[PDB]
């Protein structure tokens, strides 16, 4: 039963990838119908408006071809997908920017470089054979952070639950070599807050780096499924690196429990992120929202020793740099050690 319900969920996501163009063409048709409803004197003020909609339509069609390339390369009547899933699909396109485009570099350096520096600090070659250091990256997203860690020689495993992320990371990590071969239009659905009409249809390219350039003897892998269910072996991991991850929990205390169980004595958990609880005030969903002060008190009561704590680490997440409206986070970075 559970295995087939997963197959039902599997096809539900395949269908969403295939419904992208339909969903976006309908949104552009709404904008076009409203423009044509305007008095002719106002339409005449904007002689490029309908042409610009045609450029958006071309970008939609291109994005849809990328999405089909992803869906085809992970297999070997399109029914209307839901609004929840089309939003997750739009976020997935933006994820290619953060994880695999030059455009996403400044974001990666704010989020990933502090984690990588702490791994290098705690697992130096003077003390460890890196190939024997087992590092787990739960909620690895499109896999760039786990990839960076494996590029250093550590045995790194990323884990991911979302098929949106697994289909896409499978494509980038296994069907991509040629730097910047591919092109996406990730901002075409934002019609607000554009300085210039061109900003909305601008492309991004990926991958900025060759994913098949892992060193000889690298140990990189990716698992599919609920982090809290896949990882049952206690005292297994040297290091767990969570990035924008622990606020995805129905109950973050369970995440902390799992991380404690599966770390080796002496192992470390590195965390960087905010506390945007993903199930907060969502209909009929468990969500325990803790302040950072409460999370620290749970961590201390568990027995972790605090080795690093920085608050107010500024970063963005899939930010559109040209947008007239932007979000940023004052993340917390901490490194805690399971006592040996």
């Amino acid at each position: 039963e559970e295995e087939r319900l997963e197959r039902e969920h599997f096809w539900k996501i395949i269908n969403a990838f295939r419904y992208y163009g339909t969903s976006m063409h309908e949104r552009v048709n709404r904008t076009e119908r409203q423009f044509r409803s305007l008095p002719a004197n106002q339409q005449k003020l904007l002689p490029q408006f309908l042409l610009h909609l045609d450029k958006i339509r071309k970008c939609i069609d291109h994005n849809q071809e990328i999405l089909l390339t992803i869906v085809n390369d992970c297999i070997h009547k399109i029914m209307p997908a839901s609004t929840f899933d089309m939003d997750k699909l739009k976020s997935t396109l933006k994820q290619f920017v953060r994880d695999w485009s030059e455009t996403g570099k400044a974001e990666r350096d704010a989020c990933y470089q502090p984690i990588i520096k702490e791994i290098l600090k705690n697992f130096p070659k003077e003390r460890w054979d890196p190939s024997k250091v087992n590092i787990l990256v739960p909620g690895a997203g499109l896999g760039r952070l786990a990839w960076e860690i494996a590029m250093l020689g550590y045995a790194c495993q990323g884990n991911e639950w979302s098929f949106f992320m697994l289909f896409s990371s499978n494509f980038v990590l296994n069907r991509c070599s040629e730097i910047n071969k591919y092109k996406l239009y990730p901002w075409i659905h934002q019609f607000s807050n554009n300085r210039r009409s061109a900003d909305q249809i601008r492309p991004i390219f990926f991958p900025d780096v060759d994913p098949h350039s892992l060193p000889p003897g690298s140990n990189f892998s990716m698992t599919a499924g609920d982090f809290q269910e896949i990882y049952s072996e206690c005292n297994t991991w040297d290091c767990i690196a969570t990035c924008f991850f622990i606020d995805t929990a129905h109950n973050v205390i369970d995440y902390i429990d799992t991380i404690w169980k599966i770390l080796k004595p002496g192992g470390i958990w590195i965390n960087l992120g905010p506390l945007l609880y993903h199930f907060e005030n969502l209909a009929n969903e468990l969500s325990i929202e803790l302040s950072y002060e409460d999370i620290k008190n749970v961590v201390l009561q568990y027995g972790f020793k605090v080795e690093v704590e920085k608050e107010s680490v500024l970063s963005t997440y899939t930010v559109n740099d040209l947008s007239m409206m932007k979000y940023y986070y004052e993340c917390v970075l901490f490194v805690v050690r399971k006592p040996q």
Copy 2:
């Protein structure tokens, strides 16, 4: 005669929403407690202050409800609203509860010392342009007519009136009108009131105390307008109220033109009602309030298109600055913040 009744129906709908705040917020907190109480007992024992913290939030909810009932009491007994009448007790919608939460945050932006930094980024650039174009050496400020559409809680219109200009604020939303009538007419003592504008945010809290911290208002006495000043506020749609052409020396729009169903209609109204030689000062982003909503018209223009439309009307561009950084009802202690790269422009209707 049908507007007379759909407006009345809307008025009591907003009153009822103000009265429903406590019920709504208390339900949210009761959901939090129920979910906490269903965790394993050993996890509950890791947080021995959690239930007491919910109790502090519940006290903040009651205090907020008291402020909202004071606003209600003030506007029900306002002579101007006798046309609205005096038998249903419906629960309010989620949309209106969201508008109530935004309304509490506006008090921070417009009438609290906590909001001073935000005001100085949005309101000072507008005010400097007014002083620049109607300097005291050459203009009797009391004969300069300045319209502030979408005035919200009114702080900007008030600041302009404080300088001596004949300033009128305009606002459509009953949430803003009820609250601004209360602040501008009844809050005559600095920092006498407080409210708890952040208690609804359970995410991105550094310390639990941050969620329940108060803000005080008003930071200035709104009745410290000097003798000779000329300050007023109108109720209703900017496009329907102002139909006389060639009336205003200056129109000042702050975080406003992106509320339009069709921003071209706003631009057209502004051009008609300015005196020849008058100026339109604008500062804000382009967050179109009706974008992608079923059965709502929304024309989303890039800033480039807005400037092109403005130029085609015959406005002359005198000031243009992009990337004017500002926040909007920002929670300074939150771990997640939004900001805007606004455009400031000053355009002149040719004489």
